[PDB]
UniProtKB/Swiss-Prot annotation, chain A:
One of its GO terms (cellular component) is INTAC complex. The keyword Nucleus applies. This is Integrator complex subunit 6. Residues 2-226 form the VWFA domain. It comes from Homo sapiens. It comes from the Eukaryota. Its main location: nucleus. Keywords: Chromosome, Nucleus, Phosphoprotein. Widely expressed. Expressed in heart, brain, placenta, lung, liver, skeletal muscle, kidney and pancreas. Component of the Integrator complex, composed of core subunits INTS1, INTS2, INTS3, INTS4, INTS5, INTS6, INTS7, INTS8, INTS9/RC74, INTS10, INTS11/CPSF3L, INTS12, INTS13, INTS14 and INTS15. The core complex associates with protein phosphatase 2A subunits PPP2CA and PPP2R1A, to form the Integrator-PP2A (INTAC) complex. The lineage of its organism: Eukaryota, Metazoa, Chordata, Craniata, Vertebrata. One of its GO terms (biological process) is snRNA 3'-end processing.
From Swiss-Prot, chain B:
The WFEF motif is required for the recruitment of protein phosphatase 2A (PP2A) to transcription pause-release checkpoint. Belongs to the Integrator subunit 8 family. Component of the integrator complex, a multiprotein complex that terminates RNA polymerase II (Pol II) transcription in the promoter-proximal region of genes. The chain holds residues 914 to 995 of 995 of the full protein. It comes from Homo sapiens (Human). This is Integrator complex subunit 8.
Length: 551, 82
């Protein structure tokens, strides 16, 4: 996946803990230990590391797509916390980088549905301290991201983040004096910071740390959550949960505020074992009926809102029709359903405003308890599966391709009720079915000409902006300014007479004379050229001849 | 707004001992880094890096350090004027 670290480089991050070290050094150590614990996992060969600091552009992206691991280390160890607490601009810059390359590659197919197989997994971790949000004018009470629309195409999604990326926050609260009381909580508390509502919206969690042991627990938990998936918002709608006849309905059950109403939670996307890209079949549908004459598509939600109905049904699993199935990671919905203990019943998940005539949506999937009752899976079929699947059953039971008449009228009714972007996969569906006669090239349109032209032009501006951003990373009267001392000056004492101090001048003069009277094979322009950072045995031992095999 | 100006007739660095808010020291470090003060910046870093003015200390320690600095600053003003 993509691991991005947003390291706070405000001056408030220069406080010193009880360990005798600064907060920023603790952040660097957290990044290092995250590296070690992630490298312990035998699945992290491909993991792109990125770093963003709290510094104004273009000095904002320390490491991006075109850098490597060594430059990430060098820029990590050379961070100075000398800025303000400007969280919104830095978060927008990180999301702009990630969504910029996202819209460059066309990973998110607007208009053609939402395909959670096209996935670029990404976890961003903001390590900060929880101080007051500061600008050049004053303290800001509540965290607002800027809305300047720098990336072309930002108006087609309401939120600056996406459904393939997750935000976590390490808020350092190490006290100056160590606490006499020892923390014994197994779980990590949430903080009362200004970043916590944002990470709860994006489908993450804010780890609050007050001790180095607590930092170890937080960072182990953060390592355990770096996997590939899609965060979707599950909500119920309409009927109440069905009371079991064996169960007893009680007034004490809360009918107004129940913990699994809404959950922005993850579903798992396993890679393809043979290739890596999960070869998928069915999209999660849109929140609008596609008007093929509208000039612009409506802006899409960053996180899909899917409504589940708890009415018990029968899980229809037809042979040789490829459905797609996900595992949904633990959530109060999942512990409820695992308490229900009914692997013969499923709940019906649908997407609202996906029907031409009804505000309610015809069901597109079902959530289902597994055989071993270890996890709750999500099964997705094409749109309106209880209509489509029995007729496919009937064609491979009786009709043998060339069909009857009423069943033709059933498919004309179905394709009038069918979404047009689903016209993509369903055609591909019969390419596995064994009935290519249902393929008709007459209908292939899913979008208007205007939005396709807009998408092409947006892709072109995205390519230009990607080139710009990748080139940006890694880089006596009223006109008088007194020069400041430069640490990276390298004062060359042999190239220039101006750089020799007085108190050793005669000394250096004699040395200079010796150079011009040495007449050696190699002439040096510096008195002391020791090294820069590292003195390796292997690097210098390669520049010699060692003719001793000794066998 | 006051710290942004460049015509102070009182001391700059020797009054940095009577500050106990991390936010104002944060702004001081930012101003000194922008405007070229490479030495007042280090004074601000030393002030922030004290184990007495951390934000996450127990409240008694913070309020007692605050009242110590209040006493010393008000005595310094009574030294100058009064």
């Amino acid at each position: 996946p993509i691991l991005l670290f947003l390291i706070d480089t405000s001056a408030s991050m220069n406080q010193r803990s009880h360990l005798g070290t600064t907060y920023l050094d603790t952040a660097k150590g957290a990044v290092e230990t995250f590296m070690k614990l992630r490298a312990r996992d035998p699945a992290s060969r491909g993991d792109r590391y990125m770093l963003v600091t709290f510094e104004e552009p273009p000095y904002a992206i320390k490491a991006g797509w075109k850098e490597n691991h060594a430059t990430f280390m060098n820029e990590l160890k050379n961070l100075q916390a000398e800025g303000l607490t400007t969280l919104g601009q830095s978060l927008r810059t990180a999301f702009d980088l990630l969504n910029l390359n996202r819209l460059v590659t066309g990973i998110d197919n607007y208009g053609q549905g939402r395909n959670p197989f096209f996935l670029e997994p990404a976890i961003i971790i903001t390590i900060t301290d929880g101080s007051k949000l500061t600008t050049t004018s004053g303290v800001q009470d509540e965290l607002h991201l800027p809305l300047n629309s720098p990336l072309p195409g930002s108006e087609l999604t309401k939120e600056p983040f996406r459904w393939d990326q997750r935000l976590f926050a390490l808020v350092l609260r190490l006290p100056g004096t160590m606490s006499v009381e020892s923390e014994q909580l197994t779980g990590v508390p949430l903080d009362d910071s200004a970043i916590t509502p944002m990470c709860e919206v994006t489908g993450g969690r804010s780890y609050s740390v007050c001790s180095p042991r607590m930092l170890n627990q937080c960072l182990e938990s953060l390592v355990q959550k770096v996997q590939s998936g899609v965060v979707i918002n599950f909500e119920k709608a309409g009927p109440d949960p069905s009371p079991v006849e064996d169960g007893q309905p009680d007034i004490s059950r809360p009918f107004g505020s129940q913990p699994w109403h809404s959950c922005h939670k993850l579903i798992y996307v396993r890679p393809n074992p043979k290739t890596g890209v999960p070869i998928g079949h069915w999209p999660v549908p849109e929140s609008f009926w596609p008007d093929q004459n509208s000039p612009t598509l409506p802006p899409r939600t960053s996180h899909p809102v899917v409504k589940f109905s708890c009415t018990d049904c029968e899980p229809m699993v037809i042979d040789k029709l490829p459905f797609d199935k996900y595992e949904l990671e633990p959530s109060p919905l999942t512990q409820f359903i695992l308490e229900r203990k009914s692997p013969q019943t499923c709940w019906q998940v649908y997407v609202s405003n996906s029907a031409k005539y009804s505000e309610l949506g015809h069901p597109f999937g079902y959530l289902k308890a597994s055989t071993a009752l270890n996890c709750v899976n999500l099964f997705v079929m094409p749109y309106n599966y209880p209509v489509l699947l029995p007729l496919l059953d009937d064609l491979f039971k009786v009709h043998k391709a060339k069909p009857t008449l009423k069943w033709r009228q059933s498919f004309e009714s179905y394709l009038k009720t069918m979404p047009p972007y689903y016209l993509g996969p369903l055609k591909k569906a019969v390419r596995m079915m064994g009935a290519p006669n249902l393929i008709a090239d007459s209908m292939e349109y899913g979008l208007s000409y205007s939005v396709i032209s807009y998408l092409k032009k947006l892709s072109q501006q995205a390519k230009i902006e990607s080139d710009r951003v990748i080139g940006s990373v890694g880089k006596e009267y009223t006109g008088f300014q007194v020069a400041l001392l430069n640490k990276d000056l390298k004062p060359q004492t042999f190239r220039n007479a101006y750089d020799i101090p007085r108190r050793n001048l005669l000394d250096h003069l004699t040395r200079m004379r010796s150079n011009l009277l040495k007449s050696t094979r190699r002439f040096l322009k510096g008195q002391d050229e020791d090294q820069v950072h590292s003195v390796p045995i292997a690097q210098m031992g390669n520049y010699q001849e060692y003719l001793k095999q000794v066998p | 707004k006051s710290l942004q100006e460049q015509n102070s007739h009182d001391a700059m660095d020797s009054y940095y001992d009577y500050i106990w808010d991390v936010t104002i020291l944060e702004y001081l470090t930012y101003l000194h880094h922008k405007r070229g003060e490479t030495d007042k910046r280090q004074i601000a870093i030393k002030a922030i890096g004290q184990t007495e003015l951390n934000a996450s200390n127990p409240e008694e320690v913070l309020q007692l350090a605050a009242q110590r600095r209040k006493k010393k600053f008000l005595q310094a003003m009574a030294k100058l004027y009064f």
